[PDB]
């Protein structure tokens with residue numbers, strides 16, 4: 337189709353992300369002399385049919401805060417996924433390494449607003465992300481933020497995906513129903529967003545610090561929750577806590593979350 341590229345239309349410049357993100361490069365889309373992100377997938381690093389579905393899904397995503405697909409090479413391995421280049425890389429290192437006089441309270445609101453905007457779009461369009469976290473958000477000029485959207489899944493909003501047993505999750509971002517029953521839904525993304533909020537409010541501290549992963553589920557079922565971060569506005573902490581309701585249906589929608597942050601951000605200005 338229109339998205340398919342020739343592998344030679346692109347030239348690679350630099351390895352990106354120190355291994356933490358696989359075979360990924362800063363590249364050049366030669367025609368337009370445009371810097372792009374390139375992800376190359378060797379065989380035996382993914383199942384082909386599922387990769388193609390993930391690529392098919394990206395093709396339908398158009399939102400200012402979701403990484404924009406530019407093209408794909410999907411005939412002979414290695415496969416390429418080509419996207420717009422986000423200059424500053426992942427939001428986790430960005431929060432950790434930033435000048436906080438510049439990346440201040442109002443910028444943090446701005447970043448949370450952008451991300452919830454992305455998630456509201458996914459919510460409207462029947463997708464779930466299942467790995468929402470600061471490390472999977474990308475930052476560009478002027479604190480522009482985009483959620484990485486390569487591995488999204490089609491699921492009717494409100495329905496539940498039951499992942500296979502033996503599936504491994506990033507425990508500290510993972511909702512109770514997901515940890516216990518492998519059940520994922522837009523509401524488990526809302527849970528994960530709450531943790532993303534905490535990462536933002538703390539400028540990229542590791543969540544549940546010091547806590548053994550084996551004990552996290554048990555703590556949560558007894559209504560333990562991370563404490564309000566130093567400096568974090570109470571309304572924002574309230575949003576965090578609303579996102580970490582035990583009952584999935586008690587969590588707000590992303591449409592409601594984004595509106596709340598919209599207000600705060602425009603007010604903070």
Ligand SMILES: Cc1cc(Nc2cc(N3CCN(C)CC3)nc(Sc3ccc(NC(=O)C4CC4)cc3)n2)[nH]n1
Nearest residue numbers: 352353357360373375417419420421422423424425486
């Ligand atoms: C997708 C995308 C990624 C980027 N930009 C960047 C930029 C970046 N660098 C920015 C500059 N610092 C100093 C080093 C890291 N490091 C990464 S690390 C990285 C690279 C790729 C992916 N993911 C993908 O390519 C998925 C879409 C196929 C995730 C993280 N990504 N722009 N657009």
